[PDB]
Coordinates of C-alpha atoms and ligand atoms in Angstrom, one line a residue:
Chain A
X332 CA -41.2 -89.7 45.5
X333 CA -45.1 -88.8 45.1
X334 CA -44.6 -88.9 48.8
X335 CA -42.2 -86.7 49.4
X336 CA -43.5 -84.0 46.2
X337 CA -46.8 -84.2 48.4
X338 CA -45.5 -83.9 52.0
X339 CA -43.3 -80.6 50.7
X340 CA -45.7 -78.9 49.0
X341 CA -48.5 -79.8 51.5
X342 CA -52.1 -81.2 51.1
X343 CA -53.1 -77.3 50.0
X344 CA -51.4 -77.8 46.7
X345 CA -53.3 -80.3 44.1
X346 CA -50.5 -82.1 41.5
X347 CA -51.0 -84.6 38.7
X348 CA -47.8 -85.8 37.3
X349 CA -47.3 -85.8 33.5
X350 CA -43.8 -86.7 33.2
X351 CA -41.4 -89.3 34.8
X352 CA -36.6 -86.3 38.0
X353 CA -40.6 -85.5 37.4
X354 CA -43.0 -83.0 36.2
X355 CA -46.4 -82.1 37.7
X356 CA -49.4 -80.2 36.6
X357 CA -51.5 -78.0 39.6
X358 CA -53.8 -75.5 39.2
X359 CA -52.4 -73.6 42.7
X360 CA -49.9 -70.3 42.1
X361 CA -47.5 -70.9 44.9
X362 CA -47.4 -67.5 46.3
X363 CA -50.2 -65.2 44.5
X364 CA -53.9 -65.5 46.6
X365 CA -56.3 -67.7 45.4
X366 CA -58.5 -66.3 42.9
X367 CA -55.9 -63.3 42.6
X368 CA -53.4 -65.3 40.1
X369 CA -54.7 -65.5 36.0
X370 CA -54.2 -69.0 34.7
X371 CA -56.0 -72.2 35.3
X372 CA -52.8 -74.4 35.5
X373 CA -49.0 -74.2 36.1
X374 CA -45.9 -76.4 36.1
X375 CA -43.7 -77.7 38.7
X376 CA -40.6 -79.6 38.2
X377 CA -38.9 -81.5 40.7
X378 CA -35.1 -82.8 40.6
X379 CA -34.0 -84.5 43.5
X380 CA -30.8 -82.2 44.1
X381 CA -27.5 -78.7 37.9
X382 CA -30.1 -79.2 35.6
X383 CA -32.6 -77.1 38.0
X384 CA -30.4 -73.9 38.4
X385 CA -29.4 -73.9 34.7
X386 CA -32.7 -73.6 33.4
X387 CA -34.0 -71.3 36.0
X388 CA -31.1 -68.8 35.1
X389 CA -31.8 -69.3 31.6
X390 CA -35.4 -68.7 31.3
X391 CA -34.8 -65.6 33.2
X392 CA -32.1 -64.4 30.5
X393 CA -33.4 -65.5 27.7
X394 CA -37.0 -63.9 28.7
X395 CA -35.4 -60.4 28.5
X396 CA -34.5 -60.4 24.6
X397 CA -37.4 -59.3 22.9
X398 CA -38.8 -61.3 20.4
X399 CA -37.6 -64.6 22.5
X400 CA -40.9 -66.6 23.8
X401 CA -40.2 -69.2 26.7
X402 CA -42.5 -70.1 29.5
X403 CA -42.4 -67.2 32.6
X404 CA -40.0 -68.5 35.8
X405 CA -42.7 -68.3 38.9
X406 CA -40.7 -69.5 41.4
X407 CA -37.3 -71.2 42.3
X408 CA -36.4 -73.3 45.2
X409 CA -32.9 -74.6 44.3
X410 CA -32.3 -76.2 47.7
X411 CA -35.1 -78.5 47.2
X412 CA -34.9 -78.7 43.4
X413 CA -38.0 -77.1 43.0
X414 CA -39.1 -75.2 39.9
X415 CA -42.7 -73.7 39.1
X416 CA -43.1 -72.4 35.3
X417 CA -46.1 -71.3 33.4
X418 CA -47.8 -74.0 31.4
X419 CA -47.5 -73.5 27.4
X420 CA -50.1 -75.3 25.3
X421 CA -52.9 -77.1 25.4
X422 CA -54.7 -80.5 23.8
X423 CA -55.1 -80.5 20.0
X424 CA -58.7 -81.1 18.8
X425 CA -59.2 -84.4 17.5
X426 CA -57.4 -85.7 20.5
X427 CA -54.3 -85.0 18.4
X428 CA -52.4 -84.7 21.6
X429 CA -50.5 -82.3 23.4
X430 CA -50.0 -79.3 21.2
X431 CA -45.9 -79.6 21.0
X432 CA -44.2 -79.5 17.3
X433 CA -44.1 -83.5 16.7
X434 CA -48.0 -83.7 17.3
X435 CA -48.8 -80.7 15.4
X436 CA -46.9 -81.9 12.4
X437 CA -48.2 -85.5 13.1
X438 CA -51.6 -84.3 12.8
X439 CA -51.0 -82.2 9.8
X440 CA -48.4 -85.0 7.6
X441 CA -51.0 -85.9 5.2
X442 CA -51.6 -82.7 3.8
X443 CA -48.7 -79.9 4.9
X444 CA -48.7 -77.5 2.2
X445 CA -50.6 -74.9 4.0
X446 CA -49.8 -71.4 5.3
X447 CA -50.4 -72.1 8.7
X448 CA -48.1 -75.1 8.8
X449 CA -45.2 -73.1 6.4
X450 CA -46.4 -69.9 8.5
X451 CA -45.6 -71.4 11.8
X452 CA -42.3 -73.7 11.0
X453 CA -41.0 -70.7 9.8
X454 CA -41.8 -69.1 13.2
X455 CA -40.0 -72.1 15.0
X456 CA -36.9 -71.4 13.0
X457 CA -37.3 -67.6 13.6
X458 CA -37.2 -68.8 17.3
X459 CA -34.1 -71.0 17.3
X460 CA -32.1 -67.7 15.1
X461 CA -32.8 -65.3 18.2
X462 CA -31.7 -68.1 20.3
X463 CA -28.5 -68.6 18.3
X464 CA -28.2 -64.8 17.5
X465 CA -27.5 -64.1 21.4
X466 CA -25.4 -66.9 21.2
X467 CA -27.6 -69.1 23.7
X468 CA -27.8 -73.0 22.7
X469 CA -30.3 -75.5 23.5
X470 CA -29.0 -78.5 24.1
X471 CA -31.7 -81.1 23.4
X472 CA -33.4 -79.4 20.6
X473 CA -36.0 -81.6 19.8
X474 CA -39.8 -81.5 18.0
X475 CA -40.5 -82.3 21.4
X476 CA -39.5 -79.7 23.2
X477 CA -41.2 -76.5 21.3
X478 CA -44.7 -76.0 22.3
X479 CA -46.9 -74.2 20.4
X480 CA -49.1 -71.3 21.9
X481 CA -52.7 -71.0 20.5
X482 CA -53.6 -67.3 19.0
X483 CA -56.5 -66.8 17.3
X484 CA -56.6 -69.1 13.9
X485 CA -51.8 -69.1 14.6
X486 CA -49.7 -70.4 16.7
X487 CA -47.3 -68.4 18.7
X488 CA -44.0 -71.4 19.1
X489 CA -42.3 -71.4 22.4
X490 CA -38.7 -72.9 23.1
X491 CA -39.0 -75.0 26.5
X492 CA -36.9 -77.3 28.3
X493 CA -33.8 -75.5 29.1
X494 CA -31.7 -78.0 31.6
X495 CA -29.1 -79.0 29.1
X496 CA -29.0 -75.0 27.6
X497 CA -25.9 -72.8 28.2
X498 CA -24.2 -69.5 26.2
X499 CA -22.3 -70.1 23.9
X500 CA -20.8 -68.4 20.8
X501 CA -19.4 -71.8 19.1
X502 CA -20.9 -72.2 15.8
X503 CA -20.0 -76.2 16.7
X504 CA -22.8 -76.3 19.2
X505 CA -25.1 -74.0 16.7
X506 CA -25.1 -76.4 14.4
X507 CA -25.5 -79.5 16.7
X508 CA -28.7 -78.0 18.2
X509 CA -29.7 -77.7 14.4
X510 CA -28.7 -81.3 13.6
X511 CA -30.2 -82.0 16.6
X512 CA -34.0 -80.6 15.7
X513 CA -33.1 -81.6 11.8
X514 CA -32.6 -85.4 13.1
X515 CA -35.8 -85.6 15.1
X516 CA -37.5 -84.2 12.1
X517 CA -36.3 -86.7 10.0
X518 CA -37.3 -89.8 12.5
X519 CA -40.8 -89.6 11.8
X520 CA -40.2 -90.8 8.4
X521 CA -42.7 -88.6 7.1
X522 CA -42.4 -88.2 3.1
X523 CA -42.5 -84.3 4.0
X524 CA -40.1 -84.1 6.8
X525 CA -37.7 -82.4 4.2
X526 CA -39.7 -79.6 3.5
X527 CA -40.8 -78.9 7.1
X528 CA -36.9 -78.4 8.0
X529 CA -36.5 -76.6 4.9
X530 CA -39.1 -74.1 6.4
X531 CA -37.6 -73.9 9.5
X532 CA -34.4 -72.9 7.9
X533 CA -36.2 -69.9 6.2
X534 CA -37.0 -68.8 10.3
X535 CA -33.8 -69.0 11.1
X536 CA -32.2 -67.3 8.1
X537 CA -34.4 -64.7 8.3
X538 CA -33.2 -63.6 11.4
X539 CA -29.5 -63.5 10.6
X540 CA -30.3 -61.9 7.1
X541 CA -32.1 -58.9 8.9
X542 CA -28.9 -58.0 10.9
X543 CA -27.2 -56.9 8.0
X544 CA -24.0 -57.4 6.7
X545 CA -22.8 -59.1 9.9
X546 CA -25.4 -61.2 9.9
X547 CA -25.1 -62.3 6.6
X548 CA -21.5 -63.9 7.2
X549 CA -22.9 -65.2 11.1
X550 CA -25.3 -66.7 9.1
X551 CA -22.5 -68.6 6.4
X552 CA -20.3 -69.3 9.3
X553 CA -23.1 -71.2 10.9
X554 CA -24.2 -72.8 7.9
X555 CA -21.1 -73.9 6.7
X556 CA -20.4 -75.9 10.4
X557 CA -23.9 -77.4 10.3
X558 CA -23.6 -78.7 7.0
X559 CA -20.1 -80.3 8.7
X560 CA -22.1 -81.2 11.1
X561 CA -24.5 -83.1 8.9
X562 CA -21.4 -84.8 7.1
X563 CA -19.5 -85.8 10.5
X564 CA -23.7 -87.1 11.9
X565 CA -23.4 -89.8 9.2
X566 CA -21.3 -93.4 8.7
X567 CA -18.3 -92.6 6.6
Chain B
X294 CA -55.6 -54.3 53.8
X295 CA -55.1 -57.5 53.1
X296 CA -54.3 -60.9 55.1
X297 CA -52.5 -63.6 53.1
X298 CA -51.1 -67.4 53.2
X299 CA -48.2 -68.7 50.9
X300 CA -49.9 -72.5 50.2
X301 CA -46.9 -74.7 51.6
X302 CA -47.0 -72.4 54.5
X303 CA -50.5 -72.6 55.8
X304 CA -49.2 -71.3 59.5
X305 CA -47.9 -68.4 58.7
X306 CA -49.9 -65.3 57.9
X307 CA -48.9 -62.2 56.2
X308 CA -50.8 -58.7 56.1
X309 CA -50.0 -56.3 53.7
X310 CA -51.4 -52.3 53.6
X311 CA -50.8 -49.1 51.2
X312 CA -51.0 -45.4 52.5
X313 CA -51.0 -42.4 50.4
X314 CA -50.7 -38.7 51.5
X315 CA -47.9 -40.2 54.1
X316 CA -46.8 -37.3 56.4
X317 CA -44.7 -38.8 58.4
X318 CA -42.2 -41.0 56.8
X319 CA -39.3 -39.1 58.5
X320 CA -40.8 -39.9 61.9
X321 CA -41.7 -43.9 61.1
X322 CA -38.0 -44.2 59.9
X323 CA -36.7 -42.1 63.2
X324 CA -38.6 -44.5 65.5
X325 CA -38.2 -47.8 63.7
X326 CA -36.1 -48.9 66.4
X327 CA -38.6 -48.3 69.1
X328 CA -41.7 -49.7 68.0
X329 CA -42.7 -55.2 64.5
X330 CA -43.3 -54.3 60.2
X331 CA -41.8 -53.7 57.6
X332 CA -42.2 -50.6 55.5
X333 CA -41.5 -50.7 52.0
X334 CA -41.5 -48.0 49.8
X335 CA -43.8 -48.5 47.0
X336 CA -41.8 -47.1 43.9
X337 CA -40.0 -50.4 43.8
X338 CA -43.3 -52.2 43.7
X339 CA -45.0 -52.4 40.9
X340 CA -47.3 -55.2 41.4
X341 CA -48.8 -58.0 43.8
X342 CA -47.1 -60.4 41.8
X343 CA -43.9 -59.2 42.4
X344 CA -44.4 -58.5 46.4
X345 CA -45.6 -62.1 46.8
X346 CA -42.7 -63.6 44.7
X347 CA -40.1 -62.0 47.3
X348 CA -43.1 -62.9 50.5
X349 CA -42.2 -66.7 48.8
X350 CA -38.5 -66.2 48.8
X351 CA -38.6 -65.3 52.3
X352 CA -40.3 -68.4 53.4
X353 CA -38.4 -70.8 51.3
X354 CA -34.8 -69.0 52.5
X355 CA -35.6 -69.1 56.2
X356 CA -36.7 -72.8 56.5
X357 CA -34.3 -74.8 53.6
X358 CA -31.2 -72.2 53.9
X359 CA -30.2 -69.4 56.2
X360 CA -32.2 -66.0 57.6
X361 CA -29.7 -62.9 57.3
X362 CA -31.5 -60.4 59.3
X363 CA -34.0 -60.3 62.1
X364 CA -37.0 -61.4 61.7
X365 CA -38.9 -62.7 58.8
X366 CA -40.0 -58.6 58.3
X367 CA -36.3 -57.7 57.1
X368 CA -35.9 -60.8 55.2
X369 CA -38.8 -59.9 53.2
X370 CA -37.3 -56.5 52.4
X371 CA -33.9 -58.2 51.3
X372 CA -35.5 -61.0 49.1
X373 CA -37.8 -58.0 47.5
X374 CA -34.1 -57.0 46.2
X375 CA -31.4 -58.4 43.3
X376 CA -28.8 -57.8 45.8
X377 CA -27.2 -59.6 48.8
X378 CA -26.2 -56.6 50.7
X379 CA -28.7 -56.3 53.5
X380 CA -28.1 -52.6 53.8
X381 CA -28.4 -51.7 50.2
X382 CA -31.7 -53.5 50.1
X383 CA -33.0 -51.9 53.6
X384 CA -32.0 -48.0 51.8
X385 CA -33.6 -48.8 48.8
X386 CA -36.8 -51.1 49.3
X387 CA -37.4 -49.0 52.8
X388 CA -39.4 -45.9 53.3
X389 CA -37.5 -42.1 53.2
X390 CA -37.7 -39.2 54.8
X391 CA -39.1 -38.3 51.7
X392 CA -41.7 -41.1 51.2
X393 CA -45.1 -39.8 50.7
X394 CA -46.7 -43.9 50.0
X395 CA -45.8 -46.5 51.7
X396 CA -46.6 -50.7 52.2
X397 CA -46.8 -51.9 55.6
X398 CA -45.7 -55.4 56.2
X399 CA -46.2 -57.7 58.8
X400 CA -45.5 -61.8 59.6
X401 CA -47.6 -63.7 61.8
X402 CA -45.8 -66.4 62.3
X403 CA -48.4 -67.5 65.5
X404 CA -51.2 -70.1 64.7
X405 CA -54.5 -68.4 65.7
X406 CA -56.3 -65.9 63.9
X407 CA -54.8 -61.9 63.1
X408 CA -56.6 -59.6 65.0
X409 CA -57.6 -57.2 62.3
X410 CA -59.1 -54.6 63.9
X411 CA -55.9 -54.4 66.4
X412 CA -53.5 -54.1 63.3
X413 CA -55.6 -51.7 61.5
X414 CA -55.4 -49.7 64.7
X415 CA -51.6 -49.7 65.3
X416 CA -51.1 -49.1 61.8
X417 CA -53.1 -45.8 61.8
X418 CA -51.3 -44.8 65.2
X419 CA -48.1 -45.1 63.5
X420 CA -48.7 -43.9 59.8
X421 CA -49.8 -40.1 59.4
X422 CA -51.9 -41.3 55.9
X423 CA -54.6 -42.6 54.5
X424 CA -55.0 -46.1 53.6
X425 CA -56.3 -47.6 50.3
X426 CA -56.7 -51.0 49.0
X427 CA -53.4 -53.1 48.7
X428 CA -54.5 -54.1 45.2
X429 CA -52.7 -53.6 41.4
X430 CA -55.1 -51.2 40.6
X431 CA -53.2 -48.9 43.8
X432 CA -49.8 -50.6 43.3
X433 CA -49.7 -49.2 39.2
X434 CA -49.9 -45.5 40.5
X435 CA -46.9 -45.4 42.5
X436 CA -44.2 -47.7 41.2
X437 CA -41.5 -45.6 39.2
X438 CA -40.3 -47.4 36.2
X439 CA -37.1 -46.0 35.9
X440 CA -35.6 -46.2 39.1
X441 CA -36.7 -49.8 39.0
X442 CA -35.0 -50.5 35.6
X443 CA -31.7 -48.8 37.8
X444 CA -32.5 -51.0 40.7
X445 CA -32.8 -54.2 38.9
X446 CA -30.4 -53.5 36.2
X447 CA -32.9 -54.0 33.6
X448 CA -31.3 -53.0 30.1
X449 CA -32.7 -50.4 27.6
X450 CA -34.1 -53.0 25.2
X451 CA -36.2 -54.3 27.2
X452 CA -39.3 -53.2 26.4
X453 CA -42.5 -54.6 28.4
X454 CA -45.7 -53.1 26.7
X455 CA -47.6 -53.5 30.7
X456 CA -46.9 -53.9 34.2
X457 CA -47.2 -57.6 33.5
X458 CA -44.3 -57.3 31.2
X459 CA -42.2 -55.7 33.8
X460 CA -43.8 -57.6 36.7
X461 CA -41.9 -60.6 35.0
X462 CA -38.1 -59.4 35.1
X463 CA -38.6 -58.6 38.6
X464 CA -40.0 -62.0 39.5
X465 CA -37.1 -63.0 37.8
X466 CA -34.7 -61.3 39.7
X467 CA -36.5 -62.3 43.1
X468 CA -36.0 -66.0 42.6
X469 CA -32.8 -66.1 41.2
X470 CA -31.3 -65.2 44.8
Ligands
LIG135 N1 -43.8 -75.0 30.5 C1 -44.5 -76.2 30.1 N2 -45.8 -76.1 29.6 C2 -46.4 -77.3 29.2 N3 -45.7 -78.5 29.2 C3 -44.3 -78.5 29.7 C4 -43.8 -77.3 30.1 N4 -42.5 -77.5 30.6 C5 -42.3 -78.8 30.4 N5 -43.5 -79.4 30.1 C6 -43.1 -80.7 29.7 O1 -42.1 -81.2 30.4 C7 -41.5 -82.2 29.6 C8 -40.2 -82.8 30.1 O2 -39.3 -81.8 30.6 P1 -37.8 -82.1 31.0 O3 -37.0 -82.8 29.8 O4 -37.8 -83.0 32.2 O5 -37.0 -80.7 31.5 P2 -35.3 -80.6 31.3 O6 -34.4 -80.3 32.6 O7 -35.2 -79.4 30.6 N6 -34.7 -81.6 30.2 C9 -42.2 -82.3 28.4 O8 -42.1 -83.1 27.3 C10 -43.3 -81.4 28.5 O9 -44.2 -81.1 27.5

């Protein structure tokens, strides 16, 4: 497992693992010279061999509509199950944790009503809109799996995690990838977990409301299935 | 010029050298039967980052799945390209008559140490140019945007603000092979 992860990539190449499939840290670029690469860590993920070629193809796609921030695809070895992507994030201060959605609201719950915390939600829904937009879906759209990207005094959200993604123009799966991040929202029981989707919401609208009058009735069709969505997510 | 390892592949070498003011290209391409490199032309290369993604490729196609051409010197010109024809990548990614900058490639697959001074000398008796460093300072001068965004079928909207930008979608396009 470790074995094997080690034997492939050789002694040369230093890994931690952080995840348990699995998913390693090193600070080695697998092809640039040493010295000649320009960040201090990277990613690889390893699935015993089609999660792998999904998300490879994805990140590649999706990286190519502007305004669209996911991390860069270094290098692909789909006979192996080998993927190496840029690392996104870094530890909070306070030991806070790994700077993903959940633990930055975690860290934020008891007191929310800020304009960094409204700013950046909103910039997570803006995120999941150009996603939607293109007619892309997530497929495990949790708090988990957006990462936020220190800049300056902001954060810059990133969409990660693409092995369950796929295109799609269904407003059904729109809305379940909503209901999806909605839900995990909610699970944290925090008294503001309400407001932080209602930012989020204003993100996405945004984006559907500045593409006109097509956009506009995208926008209702979508919202009209997620709030089925909500409806069908519940006993009855 | 510049001698390189890929990290799982500690055995195998690669050098890598740019010319400018070529002269010659017509000849190289004439007598590229008779000579072992590769020689790229360097309007499809835009950065290191990019040349060592398809270096990588190579490596990882010719042990885990199947070589197509030659030697690992062709491969490396097919895996620089989004396409599986072999000869659409040679035209493209190799010199022309009209090339006036080139890359010169080379594997070393043997253990044991490249003999530098013997490469940089029959290099120079092949290439009518003059040699500068194989670095992305070099590499940003001669890569031509637009025939890349033709090559690698890169739409109009995207709209990298640096070579890093751009660097990226070609990556891309590498590893998806
Ligand atoms: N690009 C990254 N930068 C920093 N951490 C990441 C990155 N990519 C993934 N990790 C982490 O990897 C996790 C698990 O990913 P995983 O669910 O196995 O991928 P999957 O095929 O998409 N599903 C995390 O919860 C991470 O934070």
């Amino acid at each position: 497992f470790i074995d094997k992860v080690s034997s492939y990539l050789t002694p040369d190449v230093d890994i931690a693992p952080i995840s348990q499939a699995i998913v390693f840290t090193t600070t080695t670029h697998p092809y640039l010279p040493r010295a000649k690469d320009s960040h201090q860590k990277y990613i690889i993920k390893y699935r015993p061999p089609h999660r792998t070629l999904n998300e490879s193809r994805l990140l590649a796609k999706l990286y190519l509509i502007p305004g669209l921030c996911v991390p860069q695809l270094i290098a692909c070895d789909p006979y192996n199950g080998f993927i190496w992507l840029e690392f996104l994030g870094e530890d909070l201060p306070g030991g806070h944790g790994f700077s993903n959605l959940k633990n930055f609201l975690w860290m934020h719950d008891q007191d929310p009503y800020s304009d960094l915390v409204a700013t950046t939600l909103r910039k997570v829904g803006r995120q999941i809109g150009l996603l939607h937009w293109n007619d892309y879906c997530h497929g495990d759209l949790t708090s988990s799996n957006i990462v936020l990207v220190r800049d300056g005094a902001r954060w810059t959200p990133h969409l990660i995690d693409f092995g369950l993604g796929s295109v799609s123009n269904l407003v059904e799966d729109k809305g379940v990838d909503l209901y999806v991040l909605e839900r995990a929202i909610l699970s944290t029981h925090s008294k503001h977990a309400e407001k932080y989707n209602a930012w989020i919401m204003e993100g996405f609208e945004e984006v559907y409301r500045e593409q006109g009058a097509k956009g506009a009735k995208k926008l209702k069709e979508v919202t009209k299935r997620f709030e089925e969505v909500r409806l069908r997510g519940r006993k009855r | 010029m510049v001698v390189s390892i890929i990290p799982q592949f500690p055995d195998i070498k690669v050098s890598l050298a740019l010319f400018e003011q070529v002269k010659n290209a017509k000849e190289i391409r004439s007598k590229m039967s008779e000579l072992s490199f590769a020689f790229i032309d360097p309007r499809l290369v835009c950065s290191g980052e990019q040349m060592y993604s398809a270096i990588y490729k190579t490596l990882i196609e010719v042990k885990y799945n199947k070589m197509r051409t030659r030697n690992l010197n062709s491969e490396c010109v097919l895996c620089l390209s989004p396409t599986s024809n072999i000869s659409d990548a040679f035209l493209k990614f190799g010199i022309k008559d009209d090339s006036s900058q080139l890359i010169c490639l080379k594997f070393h697959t043997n253990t044991d140490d490249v003999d530098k001074e013997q490469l940089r000398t029959i290099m120079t008796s092949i290439v009518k140019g003059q040699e500068i460093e194989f670095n992305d300072d070099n590499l940003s001068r001669f890569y031509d945007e637009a025939l890349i965004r033709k090559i690698y079928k890169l739409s109009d909207d995207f709209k990298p603000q640096d070579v890093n930008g751009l660097s990226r979608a070609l990556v891309d396009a590498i590893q998806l092979r």
